[PDB]
Design a protein around this ligand. Sequence first.
Ligand SMILES: C[C@@H]1C[C@H](C)CN(C(=O)c2cc(Br)ccc2NC(=O)CCC(=O)N2CCOCC2)C1
Length: 562
Amino acid sequence: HHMSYTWTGALITPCAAEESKLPINALSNSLLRHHNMVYATTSRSAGLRQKKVTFDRLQVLDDHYRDVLKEMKAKASTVKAKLLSVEEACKLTPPHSAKSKFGYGAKDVRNLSSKAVNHIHSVWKDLLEDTVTPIDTTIMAKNEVFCVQPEGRKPARLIVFPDLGVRVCEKMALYDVVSTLPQVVMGSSYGFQYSPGQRVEFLVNTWKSKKNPMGFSYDTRCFDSTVTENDIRVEESIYQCCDLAPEARQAIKSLTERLYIGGPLTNSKGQNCGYRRCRASGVLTTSCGNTLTCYLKASAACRAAKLQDCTMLVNGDDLVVICESAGTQEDAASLRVFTEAMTRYSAPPGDPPQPEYDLELITSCSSNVSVAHDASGKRVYYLTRDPTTPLARAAWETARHTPVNSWLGNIIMYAPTLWARMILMTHFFSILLAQEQLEKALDCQIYGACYSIEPLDLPQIIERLHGLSAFSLHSYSPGEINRVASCLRKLGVPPLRVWRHRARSVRARLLSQGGRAATCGKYLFNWAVKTKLKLTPIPAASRLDLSGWFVAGYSGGDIYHS
Ligand SMILES: C[C@@H]1C[C@H](C)CN(C(=O)c2cc(Br)ccc2NC(=O)CCC(=O)N2CCOCC2)C1
């Protein structure tokens, strides 16, 4: 058999006490009242996840697959990639990354302390000398926050990661490769090269370039678990097409054989849990690996399905295709052939794909294009999403300090949206004012990479990424207004009129502070007043070093870009 996992029966175990019910404080009810709708996943559901992820994989690889692969390799051959030094690798480690089993932590790595650096060197030397010994990994259950959807509870996802010293070695060999190769191989199809605005631009331009557009998202069931040894050796052979240092070629070969293809799973108590023969969800190449493999299989499946003039957009396991419609019947037939092809390549669907004839109704990366109007009254497309999970996570973060602040990532990514502006900005600026913590930098994630960001820099960060229009958008679409309102009903969030009222208060309190706080008041909350201020380009915006921001995806990859 080619089983994704085999298990010993040892349990997947927590590192600390786990909360599942929403923590409540004095601030909780101002945001939401239906507390029993919000939950965190815990290891107590890890057994259920183990069932879902454990299955046999069969792969039948045809001429389309090999044709597409040869093309990808030809493009990869044009990539030149560099080895990172120990220090450069060390500075990309998040301050709160999991510590080494070998008696040093993430801060020791970042400070380049001699015990960390000595060990990292010993790990590197071992990778070069040994290309066969399976590398130990830790299996953990992720604690993530959701809203119940009987339309109730998701089991915890799994995180599989090697030791801190190995992770730093992965950066040395592969950070430059994973940061640059995917855009070269996939071109405009590589989703992580785009800001939310550029993503929208790509999708709308792509949609308009078809005579009769049809689009679909493809949901692979348990994508990580569908990735086979072959898939992972095919990824490596793509990596080796690059112009690389001989030490990097050797480390990539080694990491592939010893880590990427598979390895033993160890719980937090040090017990052997079993064996993985699929994608590790917590390695540097998780995102890039998933993007390459998804694109390969999808492109091949498009050829199999004889889809006409198709354009793909791929972010890891997330896939959207836009092509030329052949009528509703023929399109449905094409999708079943596409799905059959993907299934043959070991990427069977969860939800079967369905043709869509309205761009706004296509969800990909949990997002969709929507329409609003700017200052001049012109129609503007922008990226939004269903606000349920952002608001459930916000409710959690209202009562709990967490290492990654999702509200802040969401404000950054969804700044032009009705719900991020009216609810998230209003709510969190209100708390930060009260606590006098406006100037305190908070950690957040964009495309999997960690950033340290000061909420006082939101106006200029937003201007740089979204333009000044993100502060002027009005007259959102009925479908969008209705989705937001239905979500507020579900969670028991105050209706929008209450938030407008609150934001005028938050705005005046910020203005009163003067300076950066007043800029936040001025720009972020101009929508809240009838008497509108003049929003001019912020001189600070042009000075922001926003390189590395929307270059690549690094989910699971232990990346810090501050
Ligand atoms: C009770 C709320 C319902 C929301 C849909 C809009 N709304 C807002 O406060 C609002 C919030 C943001 Br953020 C952006 C715009 C908002 N208001 C509107 O879209 C109302 C229409 C509006 O602002 N104008 C349309 C007519 O010309 C002048 C401009 C009130």
